[PDB]
Amino acid sequence: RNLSALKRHRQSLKRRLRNKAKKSAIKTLSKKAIQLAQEGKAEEALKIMRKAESLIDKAAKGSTLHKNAAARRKSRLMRKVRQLLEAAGAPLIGGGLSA
Amino acid sequence: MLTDPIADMLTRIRNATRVYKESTDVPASRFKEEILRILAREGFIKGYERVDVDGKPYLRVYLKYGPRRQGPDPRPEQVIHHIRRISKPGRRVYVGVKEIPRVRRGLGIAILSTSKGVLTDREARKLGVGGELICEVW
Amino acid sequence: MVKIRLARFGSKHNPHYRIVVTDARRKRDGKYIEKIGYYDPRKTTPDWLKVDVERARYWLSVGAQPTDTARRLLRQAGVFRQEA
């Protein structure tokens, strides 16, 4: 009394539970850098920010994030961290920043 | 007050011919003459001399009339049977070279002001222009 | 992708396909991108076919896609002969 393409949904769940979990990470992880770059720790932060940059740009191998999305993320990310550390902090590792 | 000078002249004429007279005047105007300039060259009238009325410059306009008919009402036929204003100040009428009139299947004339001076139903089509359609006469 | 196919015209029991370029997601008798000739699978006319090769191959240079049956005509129309 149906079609077998009900798969698509039956699949679409995995993809959902897949890039949902992938994304909950980016959020909590994009936080680390924010919190740190807010409080001096330029060194330890500018390694989470490189990572963040990873998970973000890495994500662009699927149907999770795409287009100017990862670009808009960083654009606001590795611009927000530089402003925070700008207040005191003093740079430590450009590992991700063409200062 | 004169909310419309052109019309005033046309009517100034219309009211004279109806009673048959040799000439009626009318306040001077650069634009007013270029209009009479058409009627002379089209023979709708005789001519006119920039006469003067008490310091004020007028335009003695001279009228033509048909031959003195006979029988009841010996009054002659009109050279200018009909004349009425088209593009009024309360409503301007603008037409292109393709939207030009057609007075009495040629038997009449139409006067319009264009970017190439004061022309005729014809000249407008010949020149290939168009502008404010002043009036019609026949 | 954009395709080149037949579009029924004329009437019932009387085809007069229009050959044209349009998106594959349009109805076969829908709004096409550019008309480039016709065809009468009945052979009841001297002009039972016609193509604008100059305009046809152009869509091929931009990456068109003819039907398996639209090929036939296109090939049997003298548009594929590479030549040299």
Binding site: - | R91, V93, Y94 | -
Partner: protein
Amino acid sequence: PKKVLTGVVVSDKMQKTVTVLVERQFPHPLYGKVIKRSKKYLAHDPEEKYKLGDVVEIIESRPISKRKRFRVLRLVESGRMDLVEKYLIRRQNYESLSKR
């Protein structure tokens, strides 16, 4: 081309924004009488320089905000609070038409 219009300013009570009042003459489609119209736009003025009476110009632009898709071009003749008069009266008189 990006639409370009000439209008005057009547408002600047918005942080960074001014209101420009435009006009356009065109014949009536049925009666042919040359008539006027009007349309108030919300002009974007970042460096709030222009004030009231400024007969200025504007250009079609990307969406600044809801209701605000017009940047200012140039001045055309400031110091014309006379046009802002007849506009101010109109809205002024709208308190005399009240069905009350």
